Paper text:
GMP synthesis proceeds through two steps, the first being the conversion of IMP to xanthine monophosphate (XMP) catalysed by IMP dehydrogenase followed by GMPS (guanosine 5′-monophosphate synthetase; EC 6.3.5.2) converting XMP to GMP4. GMPS is a class-I (trpG-type) amidotransferase in which the catalytic reaction occurs in two physically distant domains, a GATase (glutamine amidotransferase) domain and an ATPPase (ATP pyrophosphatase) domain5. Hydrolysis of glutamine to glutamate and ammonia occurs in the GATase domain, whereas formation of the intermediate AMP-XMP from ATP and XMP occurs in the ATPPase domain.
We purified and crystallized PfGMPS, PfGMPS_C89A and PfGATase, and solved their structures by molecular replacement to resolutions of 3.6, 3.15 and 2.6 Å, respectively. The GATase segment displays an α/β-structure of nine β-strands surrounded by five α-helixes. Compared with Hs- and EcGMPS, the PfGMPS GATase domain exhibits an extension (119–151) inserted between β5 and β6. The structure of the isolated PfGATase domain is similar to those in the full-length PfGMPS_C89A/Gln and PfGMPS wild-type with root mean square deviations (RMSDs) of 0.67 and 1.37 Å. Size-exclusion chromatography shows that in solution PfGATase is largely monomeric while PfATPPase is dimeric, confirming that dimerization is mediated via this latter domain. Interestingly, when superposing the structures of individual GATase domains (PfGATase, PfGMPS_C89A/Gln, PfGMPS) no conformational differences were observed, inferring that the major determinant for an increased glutamine-affinity in the presence of ATP and XMP should be found in the ATPPase domain close to the interface.
Residue numbers in the entry: 6 to 233
Write the structure that this text describes.
């Protein structure tokens, strides 16, 4: 089978990730944060999903992915999908920073999908550093010209997602694209082209996220090239 490895960082919504993969007929394998290389060295892994978690990614004792195992995925060209804590784990893993959000988020939230030609859809640019304009705001970040592959076939440039986080990525990891933002989360979703790394601050596995299943289809089939 074309295995999709789902790593557990303690999420209360963890099994929903397995549900999402079941809905699109995808064989999944569940391991924990401390997964060792010998346990997955001989698996047919096409992609890796890092689940959410209630712990603080900067606090001591919190669940982390072994540097050895993370770099194994990159070297083996295995795409990574980070969710909530999983996204923040990616940032910490690749020279990014994570602080406590000035305004935390919970419940249904609209997220703006970012391209270079749709930044003026951000009508809340002064929420972040009191930026004069949207153009001025995203001059500090790198944006794609085409819609990110993860959001392929999403109708609008706005998606309704389920939020649940007190921390946020404040410094984007090395050479990442900024591909989404919300009113209370500037760096809401990231993308690295050379390593095929995708991160989302919200929970696409929760059914409150209307386009969550579409994202799981894109990552599994279009990005990881899995067979049914």
């Amino acid at each position: 089978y074309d295995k999709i490895l789902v790593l557990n960082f303690g999420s209360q919504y963890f099994h929903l990730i397995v549900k999402r993969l079941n809905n699109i007929k995808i064989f999944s394998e569940t391991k924990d944060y401390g997964v060792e290389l010998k346990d997955i060295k001989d698996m047919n892994i096409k992609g890796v999903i890092l689940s959410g978690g209630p712990y603080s990614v900067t606090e001591a004792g919190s669940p982390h992915l072994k540097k050895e195992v993370f770099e194994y995925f990159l070297e083996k060209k295995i795409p990574i999908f980070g969710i909530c804590y999983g996204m923040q784990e990616i940032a910490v893993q690749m020279n990014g920073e994570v602080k406590k959000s000035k305004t935390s988020e919970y419940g249904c939230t609209d997220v703006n999908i970012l391209r270079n030609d749709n930044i003026n859809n951000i009508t809340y640019c002064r929420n972040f550093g009191d930026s004069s304009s949207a153009m001025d705001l995203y001059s500090n970040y790198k944006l794609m010209n085409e819609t990110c592959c993860l959001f392929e076939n999403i109708k609008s440039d706005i998606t309704t997602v389920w939020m649940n986080h007190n921390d946020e990525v404040t410094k984007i990891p090395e050479n990442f694209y900024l591909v989404s933002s919300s009113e209370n989360c500037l760096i809401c979703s990231i993308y690295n082209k050379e390593y095929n790394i995708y991160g989302v601050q919200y929970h696409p596995e929760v059914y409150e996220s209307l386009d969550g299943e579409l994202m799981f289809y894109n990552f599994a089939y279009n990005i990881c090239k899995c067979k049914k």
